[PDB]
Amino acid sequence: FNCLGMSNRDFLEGVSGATWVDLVLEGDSCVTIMSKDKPTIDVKMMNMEAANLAEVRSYCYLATVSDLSTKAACPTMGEAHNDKRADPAFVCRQGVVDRGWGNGCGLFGKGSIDTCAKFACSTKAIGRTILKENIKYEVAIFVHGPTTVESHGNYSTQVGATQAGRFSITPAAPSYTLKLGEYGEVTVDCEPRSGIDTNAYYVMTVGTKTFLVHREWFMDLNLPWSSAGSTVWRNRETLMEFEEPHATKQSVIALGSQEGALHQALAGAIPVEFSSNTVKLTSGHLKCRVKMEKLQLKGTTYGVCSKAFKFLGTPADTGHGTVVLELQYTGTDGPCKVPISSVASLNDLTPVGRLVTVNPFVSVATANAKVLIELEPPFGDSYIVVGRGEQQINHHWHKSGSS
Ligand SMILES: *[C@@H]1O[C@H](CO[C@H]2O[C@@H](C)[C@@H](O)[C@@H](O)[C@@H]2O)[C@@H](O[C@@H]2O[C@H](CO)[C@@H](O)[C@H](O)[C@H]2NC(C)=O)[C@H](O)[C@H]1NC(C)=O
């Protein structure tokens, strides 16, 4: 729910001298936003789901053929019409058979014949569309308030500390305002109608396994089908074989499962987990404007930490040109502001990078408080310095790269 630790991280600054920022979020990816006099926040794309899809087609894969009748008519007695023909559920084929003495007619010629049998669908396969209305994006936001190596990740700890927050965004409610305790609030205005069209490639469930299938291919499947809101099965003949016409009894059977031929014709297609009527999505992005007018800094009245700090390990490189490190304070002088910055040479009176953990704080009155800091040191050699004069400590950093 936090940027720290992700490869997929971006850095943004609010337009010099304005409050809001435009971004576009991407799957499993994170954005750290920095504004003069406001705390740093992280916006992150937790999850993007299409739920409650529309059922497009439906396709039968194993069928049953039942109650076979066949009406027969002697030569010159005209065309036989099996009465089962009035039945929506039955399926019928006219034919022609040699008849005569040897088999029931008083004349020799081609007698008529008409065969009906009932069609049932054992199991089926459903294709579904991803209309854009079905999309929900889930966004976490995190304020860079006092945090610890231990606690920076602990999602619960942050929520408790009025510091994290998970909300969703959908065309139904494209906007949200997350209140963040005394940090004020951040409002988000997004525009979900991004990436996916209303009618491309379908989602098709064959028994257990659900697939991302070529739309066009699904429509041409040579199987029986029922549309959206009805179980009437059209184009059934594809799964039933009508055998040789025996004068008395013609045989009508079902073809066995097609399940195998399908998992086969999809061996290569993109598999999707469709548990509980929703679909994880890996593509997709969201445009938002993130308004920070009402995001405030908190406790600027507090004094600067008067006592000595300590480094708790070599500062570590995040791999985005920023460093993370963890102080440990020694004093007990209430909560106070941490005197950390980055200077080009040790005696330097003004600083050189920027803090990412803007406005860092010892937030307790007990001894040995820890604070995590992430800062962006400048290119080349510099010292990270914490403290004033006698109690100053420091650590050197080189950052490679020119531009
Ligand atoms: C989120 O944090 C909580 C509790 O936070 C406490 O963790 C302590 C180890 C300590 O440093 C203290 O300062 C801090 O407030 C974790 O949940 C549980 O914490 C209790 C102690 O309060 C322990 O008995 C358990 O180890 C622990 N239970 C669990 C969930 O395993 C929790 O670990 C953490 N979130 C994560 C990353 O799981």
Side-chain angles (χ1 to χ4, degrees), residues 1-27 29-403:
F1 67 94
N2 255 341
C3 298
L4 188 37
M6 298 187 65
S7 354
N8 223 306
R9 212 178 168 198
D10 281 314
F11 286 80
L12 279 143
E13 12 278 340
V15 197
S16 156
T19 121
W20 54 281
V21 183
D22 290 336
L23 60 163
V24 42
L25 284 170
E26 323 231 335
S29 109
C30 206
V31 172
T32 299
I33 298 159
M34 297 174 278
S35 315
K36 305 162 195 178
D37 314 338
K38 299 195 177 307
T40 291
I41 58 173
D42 275 2
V43 184
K44 181 209 267 229
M45 175 53 81
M46 295 297 307
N47 201 103
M48 351 170 88
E49 284 204 355
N52 294 300
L53 318 165
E55 168 202 343
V56 190
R57 203 98 145 163
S58 276
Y59 272 137
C60 192
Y61 63 82
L62 167 65
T64 310
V65 171
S66 71
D67 314 86
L68 296 65
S69 95
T70 167
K71 189 73 170 295
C74 281
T76 86
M77 319 275 162
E79 194 166 315
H81 313 117
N82 208 315
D83 41 63
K84 281 299 144 203
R85 213 173 265 283
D87 215 317
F90 281 84
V91 179
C92 309
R93 256 78 161 299
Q94 285 214 192
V96 155
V97 179
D98 294 312
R99 314 269 319 253
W101 305 357
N103 73 127
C105 296
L107 308 163
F108 289 95
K110 321 230 98 271
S112 171
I113 231 140
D114 193 16
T115 300
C116 304
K118 206 200 84 182
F119 175 97
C121 192
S122 276
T123 19
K124 64 177 188 289
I126 304 136
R128 289 190 205 58
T129 192
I130 309 176
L131 331 86
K132 321 188 53 46
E133 327 155 70
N134 310 161
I135 306 235
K136 152 175 262 156
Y137 298 92
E138 188 154 351
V139 179
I141 285 181
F142 166 85
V143 170
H144 284 254
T147 174
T148 271
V149 169
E150 182 141 12
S151 105
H152 203 92
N154 234 100
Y155 174 60
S156 99
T157 315
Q158 290 327 126
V159 191
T162 348
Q163 237 150 86
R166 263 235 214 197
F167 59 99
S168 85
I169 284 295
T170 61
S175 232
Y176 188 69
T177 289
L178 172 74
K179 297 232 204 270
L180 279 160
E182 297 181 88
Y183 292 113
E185 69 191 24
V186 173
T187 304
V188 146
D189 290 3
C190 303
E191 163 183 356
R193 42 203 163 286
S194 39
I196 314 83
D197 56 329
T198 21
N199 268 325
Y201 335 104
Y202 297 142
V203 183
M204 160 172 200
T205 314
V206 192
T208 15
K209 4 204 88 318
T210 306
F211 295 92
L212 218 316
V213 329
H214 189 52
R215 181 225 143 87
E216 230 285 56
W217 169 82
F218 181 65
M219 293 307 287
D220 281 292
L221 269 163
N222 198 83
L223 293 173
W225 57 277
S226 84
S227 351
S230 187
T231 302
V232 172
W233 283 106
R234 255 155 343 207
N235 173 50
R236 340 183 221 184
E237 40 271 347
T238 58
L239 259 153
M240 33 178 46
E241 193 217 307
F242 273 61
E243 254 135 345
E244 277 307 286
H246 188 154
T248 304
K249 168 150 289 312
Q250 180 175 35
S251 172
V252 181
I253 53 150
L255 305 175
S257 196
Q258 293 305 314
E259 209 195 6
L262 290 172
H263 290 107
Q264 186 196 219
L266 280 171
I270 318 286
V272 194
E273 71 101 352
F274 185 64
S275 78
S276 36
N277 228 43
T278 80
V279 54
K280 268 237 212 304
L281 286 165
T282 31
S283 86
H285 61 271
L286 193 45
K287 295 115 84 111
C288 309
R289 164 152 306 169
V290 180
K291 296 182 191 138
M292 294 160 297
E293 15 149 24
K294 260 98 178 250
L295 180 67
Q296 298 136 54
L297 226 36
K298 72 169 188 137
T300 56
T301 38
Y302 280 129
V304 174
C305 298
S306 82
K307 308 279 186 49
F309 279 88
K310 212 216 303 124
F311 292 117
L312 285 156
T314 300
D317 160 48
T318 63
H320 310 275
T322 63
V323 337
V324 191
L325 61 82
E326 205 187 19
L327 308 197
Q328 164 140 69
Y329 187 57
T330 49
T332 28
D333 52 332
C336 55
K337 294 157 142 179
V338 179
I340 185 171
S341 53
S342 182
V343 280
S345 338
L346 283 164
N347 207 6
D348 267 3
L349 288 180
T350 94
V352 258
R354 45 149 96 249
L355 255 28
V356 177
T357 297
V358 156
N359 183 28
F361 246 103
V362 168
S363 74
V364 309
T366 42
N368 294 305
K370 283 187 203 164
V371 21
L372 173 147
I373 306 273
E374 155 173 47
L375 48 81
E376 183 207 297
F379 278 101
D381 302 311
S382 67
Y383 298 80
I384 286 164
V385 292
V386 179
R388 211 259 160 271
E390 278 277 2
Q391 301 85 245
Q392 185 147 125
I393 66 194
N394 72 295
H395 198 292
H396 177 248
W397 194 258
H398 177 64
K399 188 190 174 187
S400 60
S402 177
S403 218

Short mmCIF file of all heavy atoms in Angstrom, two decimals, residues 23 29 35 48 89 110 139 141 151 158 167 169 173 185 202 212 223 227 264 266 280 302 339 378 384:
data_model
loop_
_atom_site.label_atom_id
_atom_site.label_comp_id
_atom_site.label_asym_id
_atom_site.label_seq_id
_atom_site.Cartn_x
_atom_site.Cartn_y
_atom_site.Cartn_z
N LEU A 23 -1.88 12.33 -12.46
CA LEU A 23 -1.10 11.15 -12.77
C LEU A 23 -1.91 10.13 -13.48
O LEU A 23 -3.12 10.24 -13.61
CB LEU A 23 -0.58 10.51 -11.51
CG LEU A 23 -1.53 10.03 -10.46
CD1 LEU A 23 -0.76 9.09 -9.57
CD2 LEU A 23 -1.88 11.23 -9.68
N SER A 29 1.77 -0.75 -9.29
CA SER A 29 2.74 0.34 -9.41
C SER A 29 2.37 1.60 -8.62
O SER A 29 1.21 1.84 -8.32
CB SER A 29 3.02 0.66 -10.87
OG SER A 29 2.45 1.90 -11.18
N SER A 35 5.05 17.95 -2.45
CA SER A 35 4.56 19.31 -2.59
C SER A 35 5.21 20.16 -1.54
O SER A 35 5.27 19.75 -0.38
CB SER A 35 3.05 19.39 -2.36
OG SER A 35 2.34 18.36 -3.03
N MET A 48 -7.22 -4.24 -9.75
CA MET A 48 -8.12 -3.79 -10.82
C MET A 48 -8.88 -4.99 -11.30
O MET A 48 -8.29 -5.96 -11.78
CB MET A 48 -7.35 -3.19 -12.00
CG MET A 48 -5.87 -2.99 -11.73
SD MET A 48 -4.85 -2.56 -13.14
CE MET A 48 -5.02 -0.78 -13.08
N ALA A 89 -38.49 -28.99 -27.72
CA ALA A 89 -37.38 -29.78 -27.15
C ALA A 89 -36.86 -30.90 -28.08
O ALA A 89 -35.74 -31.38 -27.89
CB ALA A 89 -37.78 -30.36 -25.78
N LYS A 110 -39.90 -46.22 -52.60
CA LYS A 110 -39.29 -45.45 -51.54
C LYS A 110 -40.41 -44.96 -50.66
O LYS A 110 -41.18 -44.10 -51.08
CB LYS A 110 -38.51 -44.25 -52.10
CG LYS A 110 -37.74 -44.52 -53.39
CD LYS A 110 -36.29 -44.06 -53.30
CE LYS A 110 -35.34 -45.22 -52.96
NZ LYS A 110 -35.12 -45.47 -51.49
N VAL A 139 -7.34 1.58 -4.88
CA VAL A 139 -6.22 2.49 -4.70
C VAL A 139 -5.88 2.71 -3.24
O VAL A 139 -6.73 3.04 -2.44
CB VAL A 139 -6.61 3.86 -5.27
CG1 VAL A 139 -5.49 4.86 -5.10
CG2 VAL A 139 -7.00 3.70 -6.74
N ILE A 141 -3.65 4.94 -0.42
CA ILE A 141 -2.88 6.18 -0.26
C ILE A 141 -2.28 6.18 1.11
O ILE A 141 -2.87 5.60 2.05
CB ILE A 141 -3.74 7.41 -0.40
CG1 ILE A 141 -4.10 7.65 -1.86
CG2 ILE A 141 -3.00 8.58 0.07
CD1 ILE A 141 -4.96 8.93 -2.06
N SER A 151 7.60 -0.61 10.98
CA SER A 151 6.18 -0.24 10.90
C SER A 151 5.72 0.28 9.57
O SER A 151 4.52 0.35 9.31
CB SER A 151 5.86 0.86 11.89
OG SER A 151 5.70 2.10 11.23
N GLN A 158 -0.27 1.51 10.04
CA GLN A 158 -0.49 2.76 9.35
C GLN A 158 -1.95 3.22 9.41
O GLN A 158 -2.21 4.40 9.64
CB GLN A 158 0.01 2.74 7.89
CG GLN A 158 1.50 2.70 7.69
CD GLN A 158 2.25 3.46 8.77
OE1 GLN A 158 3.15 2.91 9.42
NE2 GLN A 158 1.88 4.73 8.97
N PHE A 167 -9.13 2.84 -0.85
CA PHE A 167 -10.46 3.10 -1.37
C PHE A 167 -10.56 2.60 -2.79
O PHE A 167 -9.52 2.35 -3.42
CB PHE A 167 -10.76 4.58 -1.35
CG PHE A 167 -9.80 5.39 -2.14
CD1 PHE A 167 -10.11 5.80 -3.43
CD2 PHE A 167 -8.58 5.78 -1.60
CE1 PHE A 167 -9.22 6.60 -4.18
CE2 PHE A 167 -7.68 6.56 -2.34
CZ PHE A 167 -8.01 6.98 -3.62
N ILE A 169 -12.28 2.92 -6.90
CA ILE A 169 -12.72 3.89 -7.90
C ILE A 169 -13.39 3.14 -9.02
O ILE A 169 -12.85 2.12 -9.50
CB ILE A 169 -11.53 4.66 -8.40
CG1 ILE A 169 -11.13 5.70 -7.35
CG2 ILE A 169 -11.77 5.29 -9.78
CD1 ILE A 169 -12.16 6.77 -7.10
N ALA A 173 -18.70 5.64 -8.95
CA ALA A 173 -18.09 6.73 -8.19
C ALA A 173 -16.59 6.90 -8.54
O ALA A 173 -15.72 6.28 -7.90
CB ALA A 173 -18.31 6.57 -6.71
N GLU A 185 -6.87 16.03 4.40
CA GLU A 185 -7.40 15.01 3.51
C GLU A 185 -6.79 15.12 2.13
O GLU A 185 -6.32 16.20 1.72
CB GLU A 185 -8.91 15.17 3.41
CG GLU A 185 -9.27 16.45 2.67
CD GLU A 185 -10.74 16.83 2.75
OE1 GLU A 185 -11.45 16.42 3.72
OE2 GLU A 185 -11.17 17.57 1.83
N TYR A 202 -13.15 -12.43 -25.31
CA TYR A 202 -14.03 -12.91 -24.26
C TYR A 202 -13.38 -13.75 -23.19
O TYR A 202 -12.25 -14.20 -23.32
CB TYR A 202 -15.18 -13.71 -24.86
CG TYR A 202 -16.06 -12.90 -25.77
CD1 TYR A 202 -16.59 -13.47 -26.92
CD2 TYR A 202 -16.35 -11.57 -25.48
CE1 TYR A 202 -17.40 -12.73 -27.75
CE2 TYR A 202 -17.16 -10.82 -26.31
CZ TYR A 202 -17.68 -11.41 -27.44
OH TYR A 202 -18.49 -10.68 -28.28
N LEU A 212 -9.00 -16.44 -21.46
CA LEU A 212 -9.07 -15.24 -22.29
C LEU A 212 -9.03 -15.66 -23.77
O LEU A 212 -7.96 -15.93 -24.32
CB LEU A 212 -7.89 -14.33 -21.94
CG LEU A 212 -8.03 -12.80 -21.89
CD1 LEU A 212 -8.83 -12.22 -23.10
CD2 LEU A 212 -8.61 -12.37 -20.54
N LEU A 223 -20.49 -25.57 -32.36
CA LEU A 223 -21.30 -26.24 -31.33
C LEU A 223 -22.69 -25.57 -31.17
O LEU A 223 -22.91 -24.47 -31.68
CB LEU A 223 -20.57 -26.23 -29.99
CG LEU A 223 -19.29 -27.04 -29.81
CD1 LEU A 223 -18.69 -26.72 -28.45
CD2 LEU A 223 -19.50 -28.56 -29.97
N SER A 227 -28.31 -17.97 -26.38
CA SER A 227 -27.95 -16.58 -26.13
C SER A 227 -28.19 -16.21 -24.67
O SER A 227 -28.60 -17.07 -23.86
CB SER A 227 -28.75 -15.62 -27.03
OG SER A 227 -29.48 -16.31 -28.02
N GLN A 264 -7.90 -28.44 -25.32
CA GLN A 264 -6.88 -28.69 -26.32
C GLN A 264 -6.75 -27.47 -27.22
O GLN A 264 -5.66 -26.88 -27.34
CB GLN A 264 -7.27 -29.94 -27.11
CG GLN A 264 -6.26 -30.44 -28.09
CD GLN A 264 -6.88 -31.41 -29.09
OE1 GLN A 264 -6.28 -32.41 -29.47
NE2 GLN A 264 -8.11 -31.11 -29.51
N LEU A 266 -7.21 -24.66 -26.64
CA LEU A 266 -7.01 -23.52 -25.76
C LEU A 266 -5.78 -23.74 -24.93
O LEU A 266 -5.46 -22.94 -24.04
CB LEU A 266 -8.19 -23.36 -24.81
CG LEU A 266 -9.45 -22.68 -25.33
CD1 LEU A 266 -10.57 -22.84 -24.31
CD2 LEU A 266 -9.17 -21.21 -25.64
N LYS A 280 -9.28 -10.90 -12.07
CA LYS A 280 -8.07 -10.11 -11.90
C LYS A 280 -7.65 -9.63 -13.27
O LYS A 280 -7.76 -10.37 -14.24
CB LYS A 280 -6.94 -10.95 -11.32
CG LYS A 280 -6.81 -10.93 -9.81
CD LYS A 280 -5.40 -10.45 -9.38
CE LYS A 280 -4.93 -11.10 -8.08
NZ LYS A 280 -5.85 -10.89 -6.92
N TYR A 302 6.14 22.28 17.20
CA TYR A 302 7.19 21.54 17.93
C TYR A 302 8.62 21.97 17.62
O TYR A 302 8.93 22.35 16.49
CB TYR A 302 7.11 20.05 17.66
CG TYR A 302 6.05 19.33 18.45
CD1 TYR A 302 5.13 18.50 17.81
CD2 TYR A 302 5.98 19.45 19.85
CE1 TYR A 302 4.16 17.81 18.52
CE2 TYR A 302 5.00 18.77 20.57
CZ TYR A 302 4.10 17.95 19.89
OH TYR A 302 3.12 17.26 20.57
N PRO A 339 16.56 16.98 12.69
CA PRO A 339 17.46 17.83 11.91
C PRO A 339 18.30 17.03 10.90
O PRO A 339 19.52 16.98 11.03
CB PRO A 339 18.37 18.43 13.00
CG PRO A 339 18.44 17.36 14.04
CD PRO A 339 17.08 16.71 14.05
N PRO A 378 22.04 14.10 -3.62
CA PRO A 378 22.33 14.64 -4.94
C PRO A 378 23.29 13.70 -5.63
O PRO A 378 23.75 12.73 -5.01
CB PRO A 378 23.06 15.93 -4.60
CG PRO A 378 23.77 15.60 -3.32
CD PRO A 378 22.89 14.71 -2.57
N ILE A 384 25.23 12.74 4.35
CA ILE A 384 23.98 12.79 5.06
C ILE A 384 24.33 13.26 6.46
O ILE A 384 25.15 12.63 7.13
CB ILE A 384 23.45 11.38 5.20
CG1 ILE A 384 22.90 10.87 3.88
CG2 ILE A 384 22.38 11.36 6.27
CD1 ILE A 384 22.71 9.33 3.85
#
